[PDB]
Amino acid sequence: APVRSLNCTLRDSQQKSLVMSGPYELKALHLQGQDMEQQVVFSMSFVQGEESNDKIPVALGLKEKNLYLSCVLKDDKPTLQLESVDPKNYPKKKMEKRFVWNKIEINNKLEFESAQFPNWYISTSQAENMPVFLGGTKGGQDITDFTMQFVSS
């Protein structure tokens, strides 16, 4: 296939799952049992970009939905957002830069750094049911590490 993709779910280091809040927002919360099915399933695409043995550029879209995680400036600050795209032109090998994330493998966890804004990462709050956001700090009060689960697709 032109661009290779795989379906997966993500959980932060505190074992919180991700779910859709509104139509353009994601939230993280401790989930278990039946409610598990509420979690978002991502379609991770391996796109073009600077690559390393521990740094792989990917695009993160929602499975079967023309919605992708994007980074844009808002109030002079990098911000995370869910963006709608033409369902016929995506995904594609050469994604616009705002859609690109550097998937970094550390300890045994994963971090997702904005390709557009160096050292800004997809983060979650320690608190329950808060929005997923773009944070510019590591080893702080916010969580930037995740684990990934592959789903049968």
State the main characteristics:
153 residues, mainly beta, Trefoil (Acidic Fibroblast Growth Factor, subunit A), 3-stranded antiparallel β-sheet, 13 strands, globular, integrin binding, protein domain specific binding, cytokine activity, mitogen, secreted
Quick rundown:
The protein is mainly beta and 153 residues long.
What is the topological layout?
Blueprint: E1 5-12, E2 17-20, E3 26-29, E4 42-46, E5 55-62, E6 67-73, E7 78-84, E8 100-105, E9 110-114, E10 121-123, E11 130-131, E12 133-135, E13 146-150
Antiparallel strand pairs: 1-4, 1-13, 2-3, 3-11, 4-5, 5-8, 6-7, 8-9, 10-12
PDB class: immune system
Keywords: Hydration Cavity, il1b, IL-1b, immune system
Assembly: monomeric
Characterise the protein shown here.
It is a single chain. By secondary structure, this protein is mainly beta. The protein has a single domain (1-153), classed as Trefoil (Acidic Fibroblast Growth Factor, subunit A) (Trefoil). It has no helices and 13 strands. The chain has strands at residues 5-12, 17-20, 26-29, 42-46, 55-62, 67-73, 78-84, 100-105, 110-114, 121-123, 130-131, 133-135, 146-150. The chain starts with a strand and ends with a strand. GO terms for molecular function: cytokine activity; integrin binding; interleukin-1 receptor binding; protein domain specific binding. It is found in: Cytoplasm, Cytosol; Secreted; Lysosome; Secreted, Extracellular exosome. A motif (Involved in interaction with TMED10 C-terminus) lies at residues 112-125.
